[PDB]
Amino acid sequence: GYVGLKNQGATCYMNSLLQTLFFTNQLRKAVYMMPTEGDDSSKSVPLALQRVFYELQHSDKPVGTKKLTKSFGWETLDSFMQHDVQELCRVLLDNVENKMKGTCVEGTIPKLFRGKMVSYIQCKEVDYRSDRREDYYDIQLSIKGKKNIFESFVDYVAVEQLDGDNKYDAGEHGLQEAEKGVKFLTLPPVLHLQLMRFMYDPQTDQNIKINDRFEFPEQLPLDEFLQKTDPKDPANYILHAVLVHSGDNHGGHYVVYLNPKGDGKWCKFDDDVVSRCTKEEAIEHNYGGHCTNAYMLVYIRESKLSEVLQAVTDHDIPQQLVERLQEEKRIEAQKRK
């Protein structure tokens, strides 16, 4: 049923992320609604994303991404090497949130992808506490020395002591013994997790890939990490996508596994070749140990699954957008002949 993206070795994780976003159907529908009719054919990242999405949705042949990469200005070999995957996501989703501003789909990116957490300092021997709320669109999880996603989460919210050299400064009170930590207030409908497999190394001043075993489940209960649970919306997550990489460097092989409709029927998207695969190939096989493994995972909250993955028909694509892309295709085929 699904079509691939053309191979573009220098773009590393880009293709895998494009598919991930394409299959967040509620995002996709919102993308098709952006008022792009006036945009510049070659400078508009919102237009270029609509074009990629349309073509992934209608083309029988593998879809191209050069107009997209031009639009957001990452046209060099090391544009992709100087950035993390989530930084690409931010560049894409921001352009798109901004273009949806003032429209009926304003607020769609925050609604899907944004959560809130509290970061806090608590002094031990005096009453003074500081709470600060931060929003996040993604979470970077540590995997070195952790067996599984559960353990990463426990480490994320684990309390970090501050004393001796590392003491905290409590103004009125003094420098003080304290505890530092984070808790989640909310977890969004679509949860983007990056795994910290690529880490700086001082002993050799260079980033190295860590290929250790790291287990992640199909079904992920996260109530334990919330500051306050909701008994009417339990934080149960369902695995949607597994972004995978083989080898040790930016020359390696990047693929993504998805179960697009949430029903546990999986596929592997390996640039232009899309094929059915087993649940075992998408999940277990990419734990690592034994250089092929996952560096980013997408989960969808169970109570939102129906909404996030609502069907998208061609009726959901304004005809002004169809005509403009179909005219582009007409003229390319014309210069071709």
Instruction: Tell me the catalytic residues.
Output: 12, 253
For the chain, state the CA radius of gyration. Answer: 22
Pick between residue 206 and residue 334 the one whose CB is nearest to ligand 8WK: 206
Neighbours of 38 (CB within 10 A): 7
Q: Is the dihedral of CA 308, 309, 313, 317 positive or negative?
A: positive
Residue 12 in the binding site for ligand 8WK (CB under 6 A): yes
Residue 292 in the binding site for ligand 8WK (CB under 6 A): no
Residue 287 in the binding site for ligand 8WK (CB under 6 A): no
Residue 141 in the binding site for ligand 8WK (CB under 6 A): no
Residue 295 in the binding site for ligand 8WK (CB under 6 A): yes
Choose the stretch contacting ligand 8WK; rule: CB under 6 A; options: 67-75, 112-120, 189-197, 256-264: 189-197
Cα 23 off chain centre by? 12
Measured from the CB of residue 22, what is the shortest distance to ligand 8WK in angstroms? 19
Give the separation between CA 99 and CA 88, rounded to whole angstroms: 17
Question: By CB under 6 A, what part of segment 20-79 binds ligand 8WK?
Answer: none
Is the separation of the CB atoms in 125 and 167 below 8 Å?
Answer: no
Residue 76 CA: distances (Å) to CA of 69, 72, 207, 296:
10, 12, 20, 23
Give the separation between CA 276 and CA 308, rounded to whole angstroms: 22
Member of 108, 122, 194, 286 binding ligand 8WK (CB under 6 A): 194
What x/- string results for residues 207 through 226 when contact with ligand 8WK is judged by CB under 6 A? --x-----------------
Length of the chain: 337
Residues binding ligand 8WK (CB under 6 A):
12-13, 84-85, 140, 194, 196-199, 209, 245, 248-250, 252, 295
